[PDB]
């Protein structure tokens, strides 16, 4: 497999939003969870959905729709992907990846990914947050890579090291910041484990996921992270921990796509609070 | 990767079907291992060469050929799969499947997956048959699955649950029919693991294989189970324990395919005699 | 998927070959790490460069250029690859693996693959070279098998054996020849496993891959392997740790491509002379 993606194409991408709005972000925010409301939150916003962009990939986006907006928040410019790509939707990993390295080209240093996981640390309750601290590629393993293919070397090196991923210091500042936020739960830290869904877990799949080492399970995030590492990019993110996944054969029941879309509701406003905050410290 | 069958496409295979049989089948078998006989077992059979059937994928089965039979087995209505799909002949998931939503349209309630399998679990002994509790998908973990693409809601929802995939009533009572057969064996029960195929796995894959909780090693089923879960398919299954697998250096062989067509011939009496039995009771 | 060469491809590419050069070898070496030197070593040498032969994948090797050489080792006639395929440059595995059937054709009995890798083995130290006693195939777990679609009879068997691809005389052989060396350093063997690439593990993913048994990390010769023993040629093969992976937080740095090339380097002269004593003995 092979981008279909030349680099030309990245760069008019980036050159029709530039001539279509005087914002210029630093920080790029692609919003999972409860935080689709973040856009409710910025100053001199200016939105553009996904279908009037040159090559964005079409927009297949569950509750939130497909929106780019930039903006400034708590007094940082910076743009966000309200709603992104899955594999489990039929996209290659090139076109899931697409908006990162526009991000790249706009000015953009900084990445914030955020997502919604199932929680298989036992000491996880619903509604908490973990700082992803690390990583583990499922998809890669089979050789289901965004970089698959050719290496373009105005985006970076053929062989780029994904051990250092997660910033440190954005991690550091995660935690002072919550401390500061009076939360009576603390901030989790964890392995992020990503597969390609569109179903849930089985019992026996969570057990082993656990014993790899896993803190929390998601269907994204992965492959952005890459792409940006691959291209510069400081990466922080976290998951929103929407349930506690069924791992013994006396199911009280069965994850469900409302179950978790409840949480992501009813967690918004402290997300929002959370990342309106981290900006001061970017 | 996306599902190249469109919902017209299995009314249209299902409508043909009904106006060239008059039975209507409530159960629906795919045969594997030593119950490819079973087809000598039906009342008022009506075969149909898989290559005669519109939109049916091309035949390329092994010992047993190719055919889609209708008939009555021990009272009940049925239609019985003689040969099925497997992915390392180079099928996409989406072919493999396909017979499996046809069912749902015909009036299809409940699916019973049989397979030959290698034993992993040390306490099984080539004959044994298990009874499918749960499974690990990994061709799933990348992003292998028939279920990738747009969803059609014709069929289930985005997000299907598997951990309560294998009927628990249904395994339930195969237990109790088993004890009714007075069989001094005992009837087996674990989780299934597939992957790709179609070469034997190596000392060290067998090892890491058992580790992650697996007791049987297949090539197929898995991506039968999640497509018919999808629709609300009632699923039982169970393996056929052809062989065991080689896991130590000091191999005193290694796993044929002899080997395991001959388990399927000595058990297919004992098979055969059991899901009749377990018509009865669906 | 299904491989995209017929057998008469493989066969007009090896007729290619007879008609241009009197060589005619009984090894294959796959030269990988510091061994792209052994050409330097040949005796009545004839290169041809991968462009240049029909059918053959073009060439995208890095340092090492893509040639394909003919000559006697140590009193040996052998052809070996200087430069590989591999799945991260957008190659399918039916690419990849495109020589091994043509050498096969040409009347070679015996391939030996090197690599470079990463050591998970705690007890390697950069420049170890370990036997590859077994591996263990991500990418085939999901499906990714060079072997994937119909079976080409004349090549082999539909359901290939693993579990002895690594000869067992072979690494006997190795184990003298290395004491006869009289190196202070021991001859290490262990398991291999294979990932995709293109990019380096991360903590987590290096933890969970020695959890799993591995000994050593990589990103090719496992497809080369598979193919080769399906056709019946015996295999023999060892890794040159080119680095320790990075397995604890406080990481102390990350794996470069410049260190690997450096240990490939620093070893070239005792991985040339090892090869040519192994050849007396083949
Ligand atoms: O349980 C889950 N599994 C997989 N992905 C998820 N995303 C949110 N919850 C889950
Ligand atoms: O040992 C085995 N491995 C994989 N598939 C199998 N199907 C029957 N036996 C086996
Ligand atoms: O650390 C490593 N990882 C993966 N492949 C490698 N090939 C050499 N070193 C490595």
Redesign the interface.
């Given at each position: 497999?092979?981008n279909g993606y030349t680099y030309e194409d990245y760069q008019d991408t980036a050159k029709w939003l530039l001539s279509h709005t005087e914002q210029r972000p630093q920080v790029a925010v692609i919003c999972g969870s409860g935080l689709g409301g973040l856009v409710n939150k910025l100053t001199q916003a200016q939105t553009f959905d996904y279908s009037e962009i040159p090559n964005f990939p079409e927009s297949?986006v569950?509750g939130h729709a497909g929106r780019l907006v930039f903006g400034i928040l708590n007094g940082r410019a910076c743009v966000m992907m309200q709603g992104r790509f899955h594999?489990?939707?039929?996209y290659p990993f090139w076109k899931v990846t697409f908006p990162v390295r526009v991000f790249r080209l706009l000015g953009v240093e900084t990445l914030v990914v955020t997502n919604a996981a199932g929680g298989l640390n036992p000491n996880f309750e619903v509604g908490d947050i973990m700082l992803i601290?690390?990583?583990?590629?499922?998809?890669?393993?089979?050789?289901?890579?965004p970089?698959?293919?050719?290496?373009e070397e105005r985006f970076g090196?053929?062989?780029?090291?994904?051990?250092?991923?997660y910033d440190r210091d954005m991690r550091q500042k995660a935690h002072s910041t919550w401390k500061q936020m009076g939360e009576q739960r603390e901030l989790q830290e964890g392995?992020y484990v990503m597969?390609?869904?569109?179903?849930?877990?089985?019992?026996?799949?969570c057990?082993?996921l656990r014993?790899?080492?896993?803190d929390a399970v998601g269907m994204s995030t992965v492959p952005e992270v890459?792409v940006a590492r691959?291209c510069g990019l400081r990466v922080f993110g976290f998951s929103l921990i929407t349930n506690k996944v069924?791992m013994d054969?006396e199911?009280q029941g069965?994850?469900?796509?409302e179950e978790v879309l409840e949480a992501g509701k009813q967690a918004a406003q402290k997300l929002e609070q959370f990342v309106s905050l981290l900006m001061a410290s970017i």
């Open positions: 497999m092979q297949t569950p594999m489990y939707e039929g601290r690390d990583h583990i590629n499922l998809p890669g393993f089979s050789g289901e890579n970089l698959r293919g050719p290496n090196v053929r062989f780029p090291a994904m051990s250092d991923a392995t597969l390609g869904g569109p179903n849930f877990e089985t019992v026996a799949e057990r082993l014993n790899l080492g896993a890459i691959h069924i054969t199911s069965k994850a469900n796509h």
